[PDB]
Amino acid sequence: VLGGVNKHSTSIGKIWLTVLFIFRIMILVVAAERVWGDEQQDFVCNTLQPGCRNVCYDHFFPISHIRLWALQLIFVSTPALLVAMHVAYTRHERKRRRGPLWWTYTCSIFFRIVFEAVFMYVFYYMYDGYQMPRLVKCDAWPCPNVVDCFVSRPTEKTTFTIFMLAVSGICMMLNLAELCYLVIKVCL
Amino acid sequence: VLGGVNKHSTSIGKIWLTVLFIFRIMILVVAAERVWGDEQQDFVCNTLQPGCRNVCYDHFFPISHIRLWALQLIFVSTPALLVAMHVAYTRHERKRRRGPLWWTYTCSIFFRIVFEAVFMYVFYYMYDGYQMPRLVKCDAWPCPNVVDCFVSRPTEKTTFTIFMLAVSGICMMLNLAELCYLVIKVCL
């Protein structure tokens, strides 16, 4: 909350973006330890081959969904943290002894859009959609031929994937609107 | 032994065919209860699906090898048994009150060749050779995808298959030679 206020921030940055960020954190907290807790423990494969469970789970879930969202939240909140420290350092120096603050705030907004876009592209490149399947067919060594494996709670995981994707898309739109608001105001 | 002697039988029928028939029976006796005893019990499939062991074994071994050879021995010894009863019935009637005996003996030889050839063709139509595989890949319902299954004692079963096939082929040749001996003698 505190690390989201600047003298150049409009109502969108002060209120709507701050609420959405808290919204994403709250959803992640309630859906991490309980929904994705038994992702590998309850991954059931129809085989007698030792080691097939480990390789098939790792093949279809190279990075867990909750870990991807945790990384995204850390990345998109870094530019806001950098701006706050720069403000304090400048405020300390000014007392001791647009402008520079305008460029730092504008640059932070640009990096928030880039980090938001990159993480959703990685999601689509890696899981080709939002729908988690009930069944996966795995043929990696040492599994013989093709082995059927069954995912834990596919429907609940699909529902939360839609929530995070939708809010992330809304956050990118709000950041874009704020960037356009600052550019046109200084230009015209 | 007794049911293999007729007044029209040459040395081949009296000696060589009788020894070969005893040879096949002796081999079958020592190789039935011990080599094929655990054919299904030691049939191991790499799966957790219930019922996959039953359907895959039945798919690849519709009739056991030993049961096929037992049926063949019964069939090829039937014409010899029929001839012996006809001789006793004729001998009883003659006392009570070439020729007919020549045709009965000749017909029995012809049926022995036919039964021998039919059972060998059935073996090749059903198992496409004498080599028993170590591994069979089975995809019949309810087995998921393709399941690996492992045969019990494939090498020992292959060795006895060669023995029975070789002796059956020799028995067919000897029967053919005896048939030609009788035909040319009566013709010329």
Judge whether B44 is closer than 8 Å to chain A, CB to CB.
no
The DSSP element (H or E) to which B128 belongs, if any, is none
Cβ-defined contact of A47 to B49 (cutoff 8 Å): no
- Do residues B157 and B39 make contact, with C-beta atoms less than 8 angstroms apart? no
* Least Cα separation, residue A135 to chain B (angstroms): 12
Query: Which chain B residue shows the shortest CA-CA distance from A49?
Result: B46
End-to-end CA distance of chain B: 31
Judge whether A144 is closer than 8 Å to chain B, CB to CB.
yes
Surface of B (119-138) touching A: CB under 8 A: 137
Write out chain B residues lying below 8 Å of A46, CB-based: 47-49, 144
* Least Cα separation, residue B147 to chain A (angstroms): 7
Distance CA B32, CA B38 (A): 10
Q: Kindly state the DSSP code that residue A130 receives in the 8-state scheme.
A: S
Describe the strand order of the beta sheet including A44-45 as a list of residue ranges. A44-45, A147-150, A135-138
Write out chain A residues lying below 8 Å of B137, CB-based: 145
- Looking at the partner chain, which of B48, B137, B144 has a beta carbon nearest the beta carbon of A48? B48
- Do residues A177 and A17 make contact, with C-beta atoms less than 8 angstroms apart? no
Query: How crowded is the C-beta side of A91, counted as CA atoms within 13 Å?
Result: 8
What are the tokens at B55? 């359907």
Alpha-helical (H) ranges within B15-64 are 17-32, 52-60
Residues 6+ apart with CB under 8 A from A147: A45, A46, A47, A49, A52, A56, A137, A138, A139, B144, B145
Paired with B137 in beta bridges are B148
Judge whether A47 is closer than 8 Å to chain B, CB to CB.
yes
End-to-end CA distance of chain A: 31
Cβ-defined contact of B148 to A148 (cutoff 8 Å): no
Cβ-defined contact of B146 to A148 (cutoff 8 Å): no
Query: Which chain B residue shows the shortest CA-CA distance from A143?
Result: B46
- Do residues B28 and B84 make contact, with C-beta atoms less than 8 angstroms apart? no
Cβ-defined contact of B48 to A49 (cutoff 8 Å): no
From residue A164, give the alpha-carbon distance in Å to each of A25, A75, A91, A114. Answer: 10, 15, 37, 17
From residue B29, give the alpha-carbon distance in Å to each of A92, B69, B102, B144. Answer: 103, 11, 34, 39
Judge whether A145 is closer than 8 Å to chain B, CB to CB.
yes
What are the tokens at B4? 């293999």
Show the CA angle centred on residue A86, arms to residues A85 and A89, nearest 5°: 85
* Least Cα separation, residue A39 to chain B (angstroms): 21
Write out chain A residues lying below 8 Å of B145, CB-based: 137, 145-148
Cβ-defined contact of A46 to B46 (cutoff 8 Å): no
Give which of B122, B119, B31 is closest to B73, Cα–Cα: B119
Burial label for A55, CB within 10 Å (0-12, 13-18, 19+), is middle
Interface size A-B, in CB pairs within 8 Å, comes to 25
Cβ-defined contact of A46 to B48 (cutoff 8 Å): yes
